[PDB]
Design a binder for this molecule. Structure first.
Ligand SMILES: [Zn+2]
Length: 250
């Protein structure tokens, strides 16, 4: 619940398990994701509780354009002056406020927001000694993006997007035809990443609460988890392949 340091220069400012990660630098900050629209005022408070200025955020990066990752972006952009970075498909869905979702339709809208800088696969941004790089990991949404960070101290952090496919029709899905091929390739791309710090779009996917408690009790390396991303992919792959096999049997 309370915001805290994951690692020097890396802070958790999300609301409950909706991840929002602040990378602080002498040139200003990067924020990855922003919860629900309702999370936005709390994220401002959480950043402030850590002693930072939300107005110092220079970039807001989105993993994927669902209401619980991009919902707070419109307000945080407005208040902070940050430039929003996201893949093309996420930018299109954000412009629609989450509507026309291949699986949800218009069921779960959120405040529309304009992406200022479209991310291409492998594209890098540099700020205050930190490098932020986009890793396209489609499947949960066509534009789903994981983010690779090289910190000023040389540590590598990966913020992995969702690999979940909740209720998704996988066979002849004419709204998102390539989803099976995409997600299987995302599994491989992510599990091979060299990573010191493993984070993800929801706290339960990276052990947020257990690691936070250890960290608060003096385990400085609690978020160093070099095999955690590979474990997350394995857990996701097993569930996905069971899903595809079950749907083939329908
Ligand atoms: Zn989602």
């Amino acid at each position: 619940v309370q915001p805290f340091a994951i690692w020097p220069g890396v802070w958790y400012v999300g609301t409950e398990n909706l991840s929002s990660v602040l990378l602080t630098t002498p040139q200003g900050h990067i924020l990855i994701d922003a919860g629900l629209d309702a999370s936005a005022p709390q994220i401002r408070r959480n950043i402030e509780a850590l002693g930072f200025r939300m107005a110092d955020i220079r970039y807001i990066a989105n993993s994927h354009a669902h209401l619980d990752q991009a919902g707070g972006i419109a307000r945080l952009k407005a208040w902070s002056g940050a430039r929003v970075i996201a893949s093309h498909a996420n930018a299109e869905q954000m412009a629609r406020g989450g509507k026309e979702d291949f699986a949800l339709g218009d069921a779960l809208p959120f405040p529309p927001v304009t992406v200022d800088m479209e991310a291409q696969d492998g594209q890098q941004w540099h700020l205050g000694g930190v490098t932020l790089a986009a890793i396209f990991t489609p499947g949960h949404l066509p534009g789903a993006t994981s983010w690779k960070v090289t910190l000023a101290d040389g540590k590598t952090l990966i913020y992995a997007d969702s690999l979940a496919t909740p209720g998704y029709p996988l066979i002849n899905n004419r709204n998102y035809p390539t989803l099976v091929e995409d997600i299987r390739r995302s599994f491989a791309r992510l599990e091979a990443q060299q990573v010191d710090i493993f984070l993800a779009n929801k706290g339960e996917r990276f052990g947020l609460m257990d690691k936070m408690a250890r960290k608060a009790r003096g385990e400085n390396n609690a978020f160093i988890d070099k095999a955690g991303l590979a474990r997350y992919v394995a857990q996701s792959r097993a569930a996905f392949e069971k899903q595809l096999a079950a749907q083939r049997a329908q």
